[PDB]
Design a protein around this ligand. Structure first.
Ligand SMILES: *[C@@H](C)[C@H]1/C(=C/c2[nH]c(/C=C3N=C(/C=C4\NC(=O)C(CC)=C4C)C(C)=C\3CCC(=O)O)c(CCC(=O)O)c2C)NC(=O)[C@@H]1C
Ligand SMILES: *[C@H](C)[C@H]1/C(=C/c2[nH]c(/C=C3N=C(/C=C4\NC(=O)C(CC)=C4C)C(C)=C\3CCC(=O)O)c(CCC(=O)O)c2C)NC(=O)[C@@H]1C
Ligand SMILES: *[C@H](C)[C@H]1/C(=C/c2[nH]c(/C=C3N=C(/C=C4\NC(=O)C(CC)=C4C)C(C)=C\3CCC(=O)O)c(CCC(=O)O)c2C)NC(=O)[C@@H]1C
Ligand SMILES: *[C@H](C)[C@H]1/C(=C/c2[nH]c(/C=C3N=C(/C=C4\NC(=O)C(CC)=C4C)C(C)=C\3CCC(=O)O)c(CCC(=O)O)c2C)NC(=O)[C@@H]1C
Ligand SMILES: *[C@H](C)[C@H]1/C(=C/c2[nH]c(/C=C3N=C(/C=C4\NC(=O)C(CC)=C4C)C(C)=C\3CCC(=O)O)c(CCC(=O)O)c2C)NC(=O)[C@@H]1C
Ligand SMILES: *[C@H](C)[C@H]1/C(=C/c2[nH]c(/C=C3N=C(/C=C4\NC(=O)C(CC)=C4C)C(C)=C\3CCC(=O)O)c(CCC(=O)O)c2C)NC(=O)[C@@H]1C
Ligand SMILES: *[C@H](C)[C@H]1/C(=C/c2[nH]c(/C=C3N=C(/C=C4\NC(=O)C(CC)=C4C)C(C)=C\3CCC(=O)O)c(CCC(=O)O)c2C)NC(=O)[C@@H]1C
Ligand SMILES: *[C@H](C)[C@H]1/C(=C/c2[nH]c(/C=C3N=C(/C=C4\NC(=O)C(CC)=C4C)C(C)=C\3CCC(=O)O)c(CCC(=O)O)c2C)NC(=O)[C@@H]1C
Ligand SMILES: CCC1=C(C)/C(=C/C2=NC(=C\c3[nH]c(/C=C4\NC(=O)C(C)=C4CC)c(C)c3CCC(=O)O)/C(CCC(=O)O)=C2C)NC1=O
Ligand SMILES: [Cl-]
Lengths: 593, 167, 161, 67, 156, 161, 156, 159
């Protein structure tokens, strides 16, 4: 019903362990973990003995812990479901304490507990904190409290009680930046679960290494990677103006954007629209929110160049609202702020490091074609549509230059195909038919040029079928089936091909027309997947469409194409779409009356 | 685009002036606008109750979502689901004011299925909770005194239809 | 359809010489892992339906991806998911036996992401199903052949993710 | 190119910064001429008191050669 | 390769490889040591099988563009003979004529007719290299190389 | 496809008139170049394979494109190149005898750049080879008919480019 | 045009234009002078050909929408006759009936049924126009034009 | 996602306390963690030398460094070196995590499309990464080299 922006694989972080946080920090700094991060990992793995045995004893005595766990409530007055949820919550809290102990971080507790004050009905919060305190007392009662890790269990229970005592924490807000931009809200649990992103702020009195760290993060934001090791980052005047008391991080972002390094990376190999999307990534930390934002950017580039677009992005209200003056732009993804569903696919394909690997501009295609009806496309995306030439299964690769526009067609949806029957005439399409073009030999050759769009070598000749048809033992339909069951046909159209692409190209060669919808394509794919290649060839030759169109004594021929096929078959444009205006009069040349 | 601007844009794209059918439809929308504003007011006064109680009713009828396998188990995911409920209620109220689903088209259905398939969010509990929200706003509108509950029926049904699958 | 032998021949043939000593060591490695690859493929052939039953049992059932409005609802869709899982098992086996995943790359992973995004098939869910299949084969085969076939199962997941 | 040395303090009136979103507001910044109009308008839109605007680079009354 | 023929035969009928196919696979991976030995021998004596092939191919049929006085054409003929014995070694290692066909013997006729070299003189030269491959290899190895040399003779 | 008479007729028909005088002398130019176009087509048809032989010998042979790792290595790739050259020369004959480049538009240059970039067929070397074919056919048909067929060959080169 | 039929006949079976196709080509490129003269004559006397065809057409079969008193319908009929004889001139120049087909006689029947004009009335008017083309042209030119007029007559 | 995250994810998805087999898997991770960390440190101090030796033994004096190759044109060589450093450091990240999730989320997704769009040979990349596995094995020891070659082999799996 509507075109798809892509559903990429996302892994939302529910919490942080100790190793995940350290690796997140080292990764977000683009470096090997250093000696203190090394000491983090090694010290936590050293305490792992005590942590695992704490979790062992707590899981072993969980039944008695939650059995032991203000005005005590009545079972009958509270309700059976509410009593069940009280016991479930209590066992759940103990489980998450053991989870935190093994993970070495209270991030799971703090994320999953801090905003629970009113989720639990808040008239039983005194009962809740008394029960949690009694669980703390009992867990320490059978875990000896002199100087052991019972201090650790006390601290983790205290952190759980402290998180639960925190009242209503305000949801974070990604406010709409324009009339076309929707505002979004964001729970603080989702904010605290999200991966910590370093906020590189450059102040004039920072030490040199901290400044160089901020410069390196600026390179990683803008140029997508660290270029400082290379001699291409020779920008000694911008760096030097940036380091001391002047030329702040915003001016430096602009200087990085207008540099020819940025043009070589993200403007020279791209058309304007893809370049605009990448600039949105590199200067605001987010993709295009809406079509109208892209209209503003595209018109601005059209009359003033791309450097003015960089100037407008870093001079925008949103830039000063998020990154201010001396904060490096950072990527605003899943847990950093609230995400919109509008650009979910394009923006998650843009935040990925393989965003320059795509040339076709993902945002504008999705945003425009959502406000348009369904496109003329094979039901399993446009990569399944081969190139309408005489021969050769030429499909768009999913990896090499991904130009993918996924679209959901219904099962009953049918493709519009441009037939050659209504077009042209008769005795114009009966020159490409080759029934029984009366010589047998010509019919063998034309059956080849249908089955393999060009004449084949002698090793690819199916000479036994030639002798059979010259003797009248088999008819044209059986010969075409034998050619389509030859080994070289399998190599040409079945082995080195995606299976539904293989089925579609065999359908185009054996039927002379693309498939219509998921009925046909689903049936062929199911046949060739549960039964195989020769079964699909037999089912396509014995298909009722083959019998109605090509019968038994007629070589298959192309009958229908995609409209893209005719657009390829008219590079000068179509014949007569509206009467031309040869020798016209325009104002200005007329006004000089 | 509300009903007015959508109908005007359609006639602009075909080049016609306003015929009497458009004048009748515009006057009908302008008459229903008092009820639409009343429902928007009740919604703005009871939105947290409506969205949260719909989430609670959904988790009672679909029990698995708060169970450990479900994609609303922890309170992080629970709060995310309730915030989604508030999202649906707010944009359905926007569409109720406008009388048109363009707001839903560009700001609710613009990739919701892609997000819910990326995160593993189940589609059908989401539309079941949307229907619980619709029945809730229907019943407190009927108690408030609005006989015509037809207007408040449409945005939740549109979100459900565009989000749900084909059986 | 390229295999470890044919990849070795093609890298030697693009440079224009005979296969060298390190390539011959890689060839010996394939020639001596062939027996366990054949035994693993025979076991997979015997127990493929049991694998797919177990795989869907531990990963795709009793989540609301299976209930009404799921992608596994509307029984033809369940049969479609089972048929796809069979295809991943068979093609991971084909890649395992031949030594290289060229069959995966050319028959499955080229356009399956576009197809699954077009149908609305949840890609993370089918990645989870592939690694559940990987764990099932790990459980009923052992480590060595298990990690050898889980290599190409993880290749399938990489082509999906 | 001719530069403006601008000191201004731009306050936030629409958002509460939690602990990290707080950056600074009192910035002294070299501003290019072709953007200073838009920066003045932007920091007037957000509500900043502009206390110091001088011409860091270039002279006054330049008919040419100013960039 | 034999493995690729077994997989593609298992494919196109949507079924896992049979016990017979995997049995042939075990036999082949046992024979791989002998096949590596044959390949090493061919790679060791490529120079001299090419030299002696040129010797007797010029002693039998001198009416070829090879010995027409242009030493560049002799170099091209030597290189072609070396490429084809290398393709035979590839078929030995692969155990199927797939390297011999796919690189060497699909477009033989169009390539050598475009090159204007007559086909059957190349057939004679390939018989000459077949006799040398007899002369330098042991009997089982000679038959294994002979299968692909006869495939070449079929090709031209 | 279209020819010179057809495209003149279609432009005049789009204007809604008969063949005007300018299209008339254009049609006279066609009707007096016809005999030499037919003789040039006959001479190309007599020596198509020899033209491809000289073309490949002068443009593609003795380069890295024919050695290992090059596009014309692995003999069936050489045959595919030779058959593409047969197509280019035959369709250039079609466009020369037709008097319009329309047949090259609907049967050669449509999707051909995309096809060659998909296969890794180098397009600049193909342009070099088609212009070598232009020199070969200019050699023994003469300048005039050679110039006429080289026009359509240059159109082929522009379409590849 | 007959050149296009020769090329599409030389095409679609993957072969260069045979000597016989070139023979028809030289015959056509030598009849081009007569075709040009016929087309010039037809363009010269189109107006009076249409008027005399309308005269005989309204005399013989007067129960048509053209002579129902409305001047716009008969203006359309006049213009249609002029367009058809212009297509006759086009097919004369092109040497084959393809201009006539692709411009006026492929979807002719459903065209006139959408315009509600009876088919046999158009066939009668085309018989009249054929007679006018006979009366103003020499015998050879009358045959050349009458072949395409019969092509229209079949198409209705 | 480290090994602790994947283990607690399984346990919380089935809704129980950490089971004895799960605790045993955590035990193997936690008491192999010291050799993992040590390997991480010496992989950090000797990353440049490893990349040097791996380019020397796998990617040098083949015709991909020659003209028309993929490691011609010195900036492409520097990009190749940086890709090797990324692979080394992310295999280190996975080694410290105990899980291949950082690989699946930051390397292997995005890599095949980038390499096929840029024209980078996948086979030369995998032979370079396996040379990296051998070099880290030689300079580390069999156990640490195997534990990091598991993640190098995961990277080669995604290629
Ligand atoms: C109850 C509703 C179901 C449920 C919800 C759930 N959703 C998410 C995460 C997100 N939800 C959205 C939604 C929107 N963004 C928009 O712009 C719009 C229109 C205004 C909508 C509806 C988004 C983008 C996300 C991503 C996170 C974010 O906040 O930006 C989650 C959390 C996912 C996770 O596991 O991290 C949940 C739990 N879950 C259920 O089980 C119910 C069926
Ligand atoms: C004019 C000849 C035809 C025409 C044009 C038309 N285009 C748009 C909209 C866009 N055009 C583009 C184009 C480009 N992006 C690039 O990067 C490049 C630079 C080389 C080009 C040429 C884009 C991205 C858009 C969208 C942004 C924008 O609208 O400016 C429209 C408007 C479409 C709409 O729905 O608003 C139009 C009308 N239309 C015709 O009918 C002419 C034949
Ligand atoms: C009862 C008549 C028989 C029976 C039932 C049984 N079924 C399952 C498990 C499942 N059954 C379904 C059913 C459907 N999905 C659909 O789309 C349709 C049509 C709308 C149907 C009927 C599904 C999806 C499952 C999977 C479990 C789930 O929901 O996650 C079981 C359990 C088997 C197990 O181990 O999971 C059983 C027992 N058993 C009998 O004896 C009867 C013959
Ligand atoms: C199952 C584990 C998951 C799942 C699957 C699912 N898939 C489909 C439909 C299709 N799957 C394919 C896949 C392929 N095409 C190929 O050529 C190959 C073999 C190499 C594969 C794997 C295709 C083409 C289809 C479309 C078939 C059709 O047109 O009917 C469905 C059904 C889609 C529908 O709406 O009917 C399903 C359910 N879904 C899950 O939830 C699992 C995680
Ligand atoms: C020698 C046994 C016969 C012979 C040889 C001969 N060959 C050439 C020139 C070439 N040979 C080839 C061959 C191949 N290209 C490939 O890709 C393959 C690998 C499977 C082969 C075998 C090619 C392409 C050429 C052209 C040069 C080049 O490689 O670029 C010549 C010279 C022809 C000339 O003058 O151009 C000769 C003499 N001639 C005989 O008489 C022997 C029977
Ligand atoms: C020769 C001068 C150059 C060259 C060629 C080459 N081509 C192929 C493969 C194909 N060529 C085509 C071409 C066409 N299909 C059509 O319908 C038409 C007219 C529109 C053409 C020209 C196709 C489709 C293929 C693929 C299928 C087939 O081979 O038939 C190859 C083989 C490459 C491969 O990997 O298959 C080659 C080598 N190579 C050069 O170096 C020359 C510059
Ligand atoms: C000579 C002035 C100095 C010197 C040279 C030296 N070079 C190498 C090895 C290589 N040199 C390169 C160079 C390039 N490849 C390119 O693509 C470009 C752009 C044109 C350049 C400059 C490469 C890639 C290699 C590796 C070999 C290969 O091609 O695969 C060596 C050998 C180093 C080693 O360890 O083997 C040497 C010695 N040595 C000096 O002392 C001079 C200062
Ligand atoms: C080197 C051993 C092999 C090789 C490498 C090569 N890579 C590129 C270009 C890029 N590589 C990447 C990959 C990444 N960037 C990252 O940040 C990550 C880690 C998270 C990865 C995996 C990217 C994005 C690029 C694009 C441009 C860039 O340089 O960053 C090149 C250059 C390709 C070109 O034509 O520009 C090369 C040479 N190539 C080989 O042949 C080796 C096997
Ligand atoms: C830290 C682990 C964790 C916990 C314990 C948690 C709390 C939680 N309990 C919840 C709710 C309740 N807990 C309780 C009960 C308690 N929770 C307690 O810990 C105690 C001692 C009490 C008071 C008796 C009740 C009555 C509810 C009502 C649920 C409803 O409104 O329908 C919920 C809502 C989802 C659900 O119904 O399952 C959440 C999100 N969510 C988490 O992530
Ligand atoms: Cl701690």
């Amino acid at each position: 019903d509507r075109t798809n922006g892509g559903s990429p694989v996302v892994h939302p972080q529910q919490y942080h362990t100790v190793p995940t946080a350290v690796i997140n920090g080292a990764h977000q700094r683009d470096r090997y973990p250093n000696h203190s991060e090394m000491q983090t990992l090694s010290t936590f793995l050293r305490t792992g003995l005590q942590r695992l045995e704490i979790a062992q004893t707590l899981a072993q005595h969980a039944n008695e812990i939650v059995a032991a766990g203000f005005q005590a409530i009545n079972i009958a007055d509270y309700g059976a479901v509410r009593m069940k949820r009280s016991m479930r919550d209590l066992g759940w809290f103990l489980r998450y304490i053991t989870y935190a102990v093994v993970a070495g971080d209270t991030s799971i507790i703090t994320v999953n507990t801090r905003g629970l004050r009113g989720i639990i009905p808040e008239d039983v919060t005194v009962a809740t904190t008394v029960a949690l305190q009694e669980m703390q007392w009992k867990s320490l009662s059978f875990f000896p409290v002199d100087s052991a890790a019972a201090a650790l269990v006390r601290r983790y229970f205290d952190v759980l009680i402290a998180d639960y005592q925190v009242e209503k924490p305000s949801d974070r807000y990604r406010t709409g930046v324009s009339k076309h931009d929707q505002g979004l809200s964001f729970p603080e649990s989702y904010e605290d679960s999200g991966c910590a992103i370093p906020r590189w702020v450059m102040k004039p009195t920072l030490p040199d290494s901290e400044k160089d760290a901020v410069i390196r993060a600026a390179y990683r934001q803008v140029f997508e990677r660290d270029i400082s090791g290379l001699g291409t980052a020779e920008l000694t005047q911008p760096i030097s103006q940036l380091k001391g008391e002047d030329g702040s991080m915003e001016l430096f972002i602009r200087q990085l954007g207008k540099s020819r390094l940025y043009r070589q990376l993200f403007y020279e190999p791209y058309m304007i629209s893809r370049s605009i999307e990448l600039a949105c990534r590199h200067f605001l930390g987010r993709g295009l929110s809406c079509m109208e934002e892209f209209q503003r950017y595209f018109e601005l580039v059209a009359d003033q160049g791309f450097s003015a677009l960089v100037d407008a992005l870093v001079s925008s209200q949103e830039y000063a609202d998020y990154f201010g003056a001396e904060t490096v732009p950072y990527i605003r993804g899943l847990g950093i702020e609230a995400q919109a569903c509008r650009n979910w696919g394009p923006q998650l394909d843009l935040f990925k490091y393989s965003a320059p690997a795509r040339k076709v501009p993902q945002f504008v295609t999705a945003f425009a074609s959502y406000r348009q009806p369904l496109p003329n496309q094979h039901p399993y995306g446009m990569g399944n549509d081969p190139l309408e030439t005489q021969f050769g299964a030429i499909f768009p690769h999913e990896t090499t230059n991904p130009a993918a526009q996924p679209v959901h067609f219904s099962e009953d949806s049918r493709r519009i195909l441009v037939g050659h029957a209504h077009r042209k005439s008769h005795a114009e399409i009966s020159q490409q038919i080759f029934s029984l073009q009366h010589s047998v030999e010509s019919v063998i050759l034309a059956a080849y040029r249908q089955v393999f769009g060009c004449e084949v070598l002698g090793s690819q000749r199916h000479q036994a079928a030639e002798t059979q048809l010259k003797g009248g033992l088999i008819t044209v339909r059986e010969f075409v089936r034998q050619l389509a069951k030859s080994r070289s046909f399998r190599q040409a159209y079945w082995e080195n091909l995606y299976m539904t692409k293989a089925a579609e190209i065999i359908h185009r060669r054996l039927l002379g027309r693309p498939t219509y919808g998921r009925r046909e394509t689903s049936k062929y794919y199911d046949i060739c997947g549960r039964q195989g290649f020769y079964a699909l060839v037999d089912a396509l030759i014995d298909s009722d469409d083959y019998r109605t169109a090509f019968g038994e004594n007629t070589v298959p021929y192309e009958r229908y194409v995609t409209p893209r096929g005719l657009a390829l078959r008219s590079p000068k444009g179509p014949v007569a779409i509206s009467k031309l205006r040869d020798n016209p009069h325009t104002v200005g040349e007329y006004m000089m009356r | 685009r509300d009903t007015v601007t959508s109908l005007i844009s359609n006639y602009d794209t075909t080049g016609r002036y306003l015929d009497r059918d458009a004048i009748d439809s515009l006057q009908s929308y302008f008459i229903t606008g008092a009820n639409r504003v009343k429902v928007a007011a009740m919604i703005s006064a009871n939105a947290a109750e409506i969205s949260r109680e719909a989430g609670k009713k959904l988790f009672e009828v679909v029990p698995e979502l708060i169970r450990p396998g479900g994609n609303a188990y922890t309170t992080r995911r629970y709060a995310a689901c309730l915030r989604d409920m508030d999202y649906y209620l707010r944009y359905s109220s926007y569409a109720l004011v406008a009388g048109n689903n363009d707001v839903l088209m560009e700001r609710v259905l613009q990739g919701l299925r892609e997000t819910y398939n990326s995160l593993g969010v189940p589609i059908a509990p989401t539309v079941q909770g949307i229907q619980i929200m619709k029945e809730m706003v229907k019943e407190r509108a009927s108690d408030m005194g609005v006989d015509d509950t037809s207007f408040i029926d449409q945005p939740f049904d549109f979100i459900s239809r565009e989000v749900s699958e084909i059986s | 359809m390229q295999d470890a032998i044919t990849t070795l021949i093609n890298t030697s043939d693009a440079q224009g010489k005979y296969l060298d000593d390190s390539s011959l060591d890689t060839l010996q490695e394939y020639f001596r892992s062939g027996d366990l690859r054949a035994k693993a493929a025979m076991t997979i052939s015997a127990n493929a339906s049991t694998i797919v039953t177990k795989t869907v049992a531990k990963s795709l059932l009793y989540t609301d991806i299976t209930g009404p409005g799921g992608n596994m609802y509307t029984c033809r869709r369940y049969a479609a998911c089972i048929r796809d899982m069979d295809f991943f098992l068979r093609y991971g086996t084909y890649a395992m036996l031949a030594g290289d995943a060229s069959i995966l790359d050319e028959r499955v992973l080229n356009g399956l992401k576009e197809t699954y995004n077009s149908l609305g098939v949840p890609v993370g869910a089918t990645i989870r199903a592939v690694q559940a299949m990987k764990e099932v084969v790990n459980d009923m085969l052992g480590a060595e052949a298990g990690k050898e076939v889980g290599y190409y199962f993880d290749h399938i997941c990489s082509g999906l993710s | 190119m001719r530069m403006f040395r601008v000191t201004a303090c731009v306050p936030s009136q629409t958002r509460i910064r939690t602990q990290r979103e707080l950056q600074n507001t009192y910035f002294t910044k070299l501003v290019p001429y072709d953007n200073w109009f838009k920066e003045q308008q932007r920091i007037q839109k957000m509500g900043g008191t502009i206390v110091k605007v001088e011409l860091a680079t270039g002279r006054r009354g330049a008919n040419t050669g100013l960039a | 390769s034999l493995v690729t023929e077994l997989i593609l035969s298992a494919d196109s009928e949507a079924r896992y490889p049979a016990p017979k196919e995997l049995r042939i696979f075990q036999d082949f991976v046992k024979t791989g040591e002998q096949r590596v030995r044959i390949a090493k021998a061919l790679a060791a004596n490529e120079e001299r099988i090419v030299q002696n092939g040129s010797q007797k191919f010029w002693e039998r049929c001198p009416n070829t563009p090879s010995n027409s006085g242009v030493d560049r054409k002799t170099a091209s003929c030597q290189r072609d003979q070396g490429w084809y014995v290398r393709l035979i070694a590839y078929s030995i290692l692969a155990g199927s004529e797939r390297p011999l066909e796919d690189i060497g013997t699909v477009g033989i006729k169009e390539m050598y007719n475009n090159l204007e070299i007559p086909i059957r003189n190349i057939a004679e030269c390939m018989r000459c290299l077949k006799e040398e491959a007899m002369a330098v290899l042991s009997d089982e190895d000679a038959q294994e190389v002979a299968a692909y040399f006869d495939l070449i003779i079929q090709s031209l």
